[PDB]
A = this chain, B = another copy of it.
Amino acid sequence: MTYIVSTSTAFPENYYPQTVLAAALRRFFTVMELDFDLEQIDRFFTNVKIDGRYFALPLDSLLDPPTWGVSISRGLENSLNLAETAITKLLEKTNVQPQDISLLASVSMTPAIPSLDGRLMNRIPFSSTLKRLPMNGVGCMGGAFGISRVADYLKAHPKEAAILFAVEISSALWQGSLQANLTSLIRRLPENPSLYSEIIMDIITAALFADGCGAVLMVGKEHPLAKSGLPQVIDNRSFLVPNTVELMGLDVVDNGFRNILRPEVSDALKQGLRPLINGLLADNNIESENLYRWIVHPGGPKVIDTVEAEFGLDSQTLQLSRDTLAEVGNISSATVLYMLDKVLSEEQSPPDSYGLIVAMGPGLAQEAILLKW
């Protein structure tokens, strides 16, 4: 099995209260004379249950946005800076030399060819023969997805150590994509009311997603750092719900990027969540009521409610999902790593207690990881 040894996070300098971000979007609507009810901005910025968010990229780009390449360059540079900080903090706290890392796995939606993990090799003295696992196309689920893929690798390499990091810059959407699309949709709205749901989805995207980075150090069973107090990855499983590609994803469009998040995600989630988790738990002779801890990615407050209702959970079991959403918002693939970092600073989990990491993302795909302390 694989041992999760330590975690770290990194955030940009500028933390904005959710009230400030809502007012920023309201002002953009108002200065632009867009015929749309401003109360819907407040409604969805309130209903997402987020108190504030880190933005790596400027907020003033709302009114006058820079060029595509400039924003792309800034997102790439900020992603590298956060990833380097998270990895350096992780290595320092574990007293692990970079040359003793065998695999560096990455998940990020920031366009990077070569990948972020390759570029970091020029900032941190990894050995030039470092193995890399640059993953993409997984979106919000990438944090849990990466843990599973690294655990599968360390199954065959019990002596090795691996680092996984997840970094996302959701503020790139505020650099011109959200502005151009909301303007076009609202101005074309009078001629066809079918665009109303499209405007709402873009407002929800502006309300929900934030910037951040998390990292995790994972080692094989025979590594010196594999100690009995640590969570062990004992199994993992993926699930993809058929014919749900259009429900969630990130599309490249004329206006830049467009985040896709349809309201039918919550009901498609039910089609995959219980078959995924029930099968994983049963195949390990575990019942869900005996799980000591849940670590569920907060795609939204509705997603948390759906997971709670589907498994009949007491409403403080997923409190970490709600607290994380309030503190940092939805930071996409990095969120579950941030949450895992919070757990590892809680008191020592009772021995032999079982935990579950659950994430959902484009696909529509779900990832489940069974942990044991």
Contacts and interface: CB of A to CB of B under 8 A. Distances in A.
A242 B128 contact: yes
**Chain multiplicity (copies):** 2
Interface size class of A (residues with CB under 8 A): 35 or more
A250 interface: yes
Interface in A254-268: 254
B112 A137 contact: yes
A129 B149 CA distance: 14
B139 A250 contact: no
Given A249-B114, A252-B111, A238 B130 contact: yes
A113 B133 contact: no
A188 to B, nearest CB: 16
A116 interface: yes
A114 B135 contact: no
Contact of A119 (B72, B121, B245): B245
A305 interface: no
A253 interface: yes
Nearest to A126: B240
Interface string A126-160: 00111111111111000000000100110111000
Contact of A365 (B109, B118, B155, B365): B118
A150 B251 CA distance: 28
A8 to B, nearest CB: 22
A114 B265 CA distance: 14
A312 interface: no
A133 B118 contact: no
Contacts of A129: 237-239, 276, 279
B245 A69 contact: no
Interface-centre pick from A112, A119, A137 (highest chain B CB count, 10 A): A137
Nearest to A125: B242
Interface string A104-116: 0010010111111
Contacts of A363: 114-115, 118, 121
B132 A238 contact: yes
A153 B152 CA distance: 7
A103 to B, nearest CB: 9
A132 to B, nearest CB: 7
A95 interface: no
Contact of A121 (B240, B279, B362): B240
Interface string A228-242: 000000000111111
A67 B252 CA distance: 11
A68 interface: yes
A243 interface: yes
B149 A136 contact: no
A117 B137 CA distance: 9
A365 B138 contact: no
Given A128-B275, A153-B153, A155-B157, 8 more contacts: A68-B254, A69-B252, A113-B138, A113-B362, A118-B137, A118-B365, A121-B240, A134-B136
15 contacts: A106-B137, A113-B136, A113-B138, A114-B138, A114-B248, A114-B363, A114-B364, A115-B138, A115-B363, A118-B245, A118-B362, A118-B363, A129-B276, A129-B279, A132-B240
Interface of A: 67-69, 72, 106, 109, 111-119, 121-122, 128-139, 149, 152-153, 155-157, 237-243, 245, 248-254, 272, 275-276, 279, 361-365
Q: Which 8 pairs show the lowest CB-CB distances between chains A and B?
A: A115-B137, A156-B156, A114-B362, A155-B156, A113-B250, A136-B136, A114-B363, A134-B137
